[PDB]
Ligand SMILES: CCCCCCCCO[C@@H]1O[C@H](CO)[C@@H](O)[C@H](O)[C@H]1O
Ligand SMILES: CCCCCCCCO[C@@H]1O[C@H](CO)[C@@H](O)[C@H](O)[C@H]1O
Ligand SMILES: CCCCCCCCO[C@@H]1O[C@H](CO)[C@@H](O)[C@H](O)[C@H]1O
Ligand SMILES: CCCCCCCCCCCCCCCC(=O)O
Ligand SMILES: CCCCCCCCCCCCCCCC(=O)O
């Protein structure tokens with residue numbers, strides 16, 4: 001929109017640049033990747049920053065940002081707030097690719113991978129619903145709670161059958177490392193929503209709320225992808241033999 | 243919306259309660275489920291009532307309900323009618339989870355499961371299109387007819403290759419029982435649409451139309467899930483050995 | 485809309501008729517298809533014209549067509565143009581079914597098929613974003629470029645691991661033929677977008693732009709499906725034995 005907020009603007013352009021750099025680094029890193037399992041995981045990995053760039057373009061252009069009036073009870077009840085709904089929306093595409101990458105690395109069951117992606121999509125769409133609901137504060141937090149439930153379904157797989165699959169696939173070392181990053185970093189998103197302007201609004205700055213999500217993306221997406229890709233490039237032997 | 247219709251309101255809250263009770267019953271029933279195939283189907287099953295609750299929250303909050311003006315020729319031509327479009331929309335997520343549960347139980351081909359889910363999604367989205375179309379009555383019913391065609395694609399699998407897979411997976415008894423429930427109960431949805439306010443409007447009450455869908459959901463989702471889960475919990479032997 | 489343009493109208497009705505004829509021809513051609521791989525690919529194939537008909541109904545009814553104001557710099561800057569956004573939207577469902585059909589025929593890896601469909605969906609949604617963006621010309625073309633990148637991900641599979649899979653599946657002859665059709669015909673869509681009213685507008689006619697896409701659909705969907713189905717019906721032996 002007619003945005004003149006440098007704090008807000010910078011939080012978006014910064015990741016267009018970092019995501020672009022990521023794509024180049026990854027394409028390069030895959031220069032000598034053997035066909036099969038390795039090459040595939042490499043493909044799933046390149047998609048992460050590509051989707052991310054698309055997301056930040058939507059926000060920067062104003063296409064996926066809108067004004068939402070907060071309901072009675074909210075700290076900003078009666079006011080219109082800038083909602084970056086494009087973030088929720090695009091996650092529904094980026095979280096599934098992150099999970100496919102991990103699923104392949106761990107060589108998990110097809111039925112398990114499918115159930116997890118379904119739960120992840122549900123988590124993202126109910127989160128969008130929480131942000132878009134304007135009739136009553138009760139419904140906004142009800143969606144947030146249901147979204148949390150789907151999040152638990154996704155996490156349960158990472159702590160159970162996916163870890164067991166990685167152990168039999170010979171990738172337990174890298175999986176355990178990535179699992180910690182996923183759980184810790186993913187817990188950051190619902191905390192930002194809750195503390196930010198759309199939840200409790202303990203922090204009323206939209207620019208600050210935006211920078212919090214942008215920093216998380218840097219680690220949950222770009223650094224995560226790099227660590228995964230770097231391991232695969234140096235362990236094509238154990239990955240391909242699966 | 244500014245709804246004061248108790249008939250309409252009650253048809254929604256009733257299922258928020260029943261769906262909530264279902265989730266608890268299911269989590270409990272899965273207390274002693276062995277890892278592998280069983281545990282997975284248990285996961286796919288818990289997702290059904292979770293998605294359902296999300297759907298009823300959307301309707302209750304007014305987020306996924308809207309006013310649609312009926313075209314010339316319609317029994318209510320020129321009037322604005324309350325459309326619970328959130329139902330169509332959410333089915334696109336709930337019907338696929340019901341099918342995954344059945345697909346696993348029957349241990350069907352990956353290519354078959356994928357084709358069926360695609361047809362199911364097409365059925366749900368063209369049904370939404372039928373409800374949202376306002377230019378001419380002809381187009382509303384054209385979408386309804388195409389939606390019926392996708393429904394036939396889904397059903398053809400249940401009467402052919404999915405039954406054959408269940409027979410070789412040792413789950414033909416439970417599959418045949420669930421198949422009857424699915425076909426009979428699913429035929430109920432297009433009949434309600436056709437007889438209700440959005441189709442022919444033989445019944446002009448939006449509250450009554452809503453209660454019809456709510457009753458179907460109780461059986462097609464909650465009772466269906468219970469029957470499936472109860473069998474799996476008592477036959478983990480034949481399910482896991484797949 | 486209040487369309488009186490015969491050029492535009494005819495480009496839509498023509499394909500409702502051709503798509504309808506296609507469905508009948510295909511159902512018929514599958515009369516004596518043996519169960520298993522063959523029958524499945526037959527199913528994936530019938531879905532193509534079904535989805536296509538749904539798409540043209542959306543456009544004809546006006547449900548998925550809208551007016552978009554072009555930004556400064558555009559050849560039609562400041563004017564409102566008719567956007568057939570329903571095409572982009574529905575492709576997100578039709579391109580994936582075309583790819584499933586090919587994936588089965590070639591008996592490709594599950595992880596590869598999944599990565600490709602994800603990239604295809606990204607291609608379609610960023611293309612929609614390009615069409616819907618109105619704030620600045622820069623963002624419209626930025627989305628177009630990102631969409632092109634996803635297109636490359638999809639194509640890379642057709643020239644690498646999918647061809648290798650078809651060779652080991654004994655379907656390299658038919659795959660190589662279909663691959664040429666897919667690549668050549670798919671390159672046509674971004675060219676029409678670029679040359680048409682939404683891109684550079686070298687051709688400002690919306691009716692002409694619409695006919696270009698309609699002709700491509702005839703070959704990329706109907707003729708493509710026929711060629712694939714006809715081969716399968718005459719080679720059920722090599723297909724099923726997979
Ligand atoms: C699953 C977690 C659900 C938490 C529900 C929190 C409901 C409280 O909601 C909070 O109440 C405060 C005081 O009125 C307001 O200032 C905040 O803006 C509002 O979000
Ligand atoms: C696939 C089944 C298609 C059925 C198409 C039915 C078209 C008739 O449509 C019906 O006509 C009645 C009389 O004008 C009206 O009162 C109804 O509201 C209208 O839905
Ligand atoms: C990936 C390919 C990106 C191409 C970016 C093209 C940007 C130019 O954009 C073009 O500029 C012309 C002159 O101002 C206008 O007349 C056209 O309408 C406009 O689309
Ligand atoms: C690998 C399977 C993926 C299936 C994913 C289904 C859900 C896709 C949701 C896609 C939303 C895309 C919106 C992008 C918006 C933007 O960045 O401009
Ligand atoms: C297991 C694969 C699933 C892929 C599913 C693709 C289509 C998803 C459609 C999701 C619509 C979700 C809307 C929920 C709305 C609500 O309840 O508030």
Ligand SMILES: CCCCCCCCCCCCCCCC(=O)O
Pocket residue numbers: 356359360363367368371535538539540542548570573574576577580581605
């Ligand atoms: C086989 C997996 C498919 C998963 C597909 C996910 C994305 C589906 C997008 C569907 C858009 C449908 C809109 C149809 C509109 C119309 O024709 O009226």
Ligand SMILES: [Cl-]
Pocket residue numbers: 051052055090091094
């Ligand atoms: Cl993203």
Ligand SMILES: [Cl-]
Pocket residue numbers: 008059065082084
């Ligand atoms: Cl913003």
Ligand SMILES: [Cl-]
Pocket residue numbers: 293294297332333336
């Ligand atoms: Cl539902």
Ligand SMILES: [Cl-]
Pocket residue numbers: 250301307324326
């Ligand atoms: Cl309602």
Ligand SMILES: [Cl-]
Pocket residue numbers: 535536539574575578
């Ligand atoms: Cl289409």
Ligand SMILES: [Cl-]
Pocket residue numbers: 492543549566568
């Ligand atoms: Cl048009």
